[PDB]
């Protein structure tokens, strides 16, 4: 029984298998906007210990996703932790949409 | 930001290079010494 799931607006994040510590990497979460209304959102990654984010950690990037389109956001990160981290990326829209 | 260049017949033969804004650096600043690599990103102080 095929059973598909869908969101119509979501964040897709694909991390590599593993990364050497102290080696800079780039995260590229992509916003998918399958709604019929042109949108605008703010995307930021929650700061956590062991990650040396850019700008300090609390900053957010304004990015707008047209109707039926996708947009990526780049986040440079050098993981200075020891074993593992749990990074969360949050995209928040407007009160109009 | 990033810029990658793949090989047509064998995409596994790639080359990824980081590049920066027209005045900033290509890599995040970090204070690294032997085992410890403490981060140094944020603001820099003033001479009050």
């Amino acid at each position: 029984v095929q059973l598909r799931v869908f969101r119509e607006f979501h964040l897709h994040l694909r991390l590599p298998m593993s990364v050497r510590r102290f080696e800079q990497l780039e995260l590229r979460p992509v916003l998918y906007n399958y709604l019929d209304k042109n949108l605008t959102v703010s995307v930021h990654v929650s700061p956590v210990e062991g990650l040396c984010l850019a700008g300090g950690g609390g900053l957010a990037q304004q990015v707008l996703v047209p109707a039926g389109s996708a947009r990526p956001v780049a986040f440079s990160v050098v993981p200075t932790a020891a074993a593992a981290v749990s990074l969360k990326v949050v995209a928040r829209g407007s009160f109009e949409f | 930001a990033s810029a990658t260049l793949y090989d047509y017949y064998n995409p596994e033969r790639r080359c990824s290079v980081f590049y920066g804004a027209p005045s900033k650096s290509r890599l995040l600043a970090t204070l690294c010494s032997a085992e410890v690599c403490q981060c140094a990103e944020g603001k820099c102080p003033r001479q009050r």
């Binding site: 700008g55 900053l59 | 804004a21 027209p22 944020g42 603001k43 820099c44 003033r46």
Partner: peptide, 12 residues
């Protein structure tokens, strides 16, 4: 030239 907002880390 690139325009930033609430990013410039230079005070005063």
């Amino acid at each position: 030239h690139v325009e930033y907002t609430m990013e410039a880390n230079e005070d005063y």
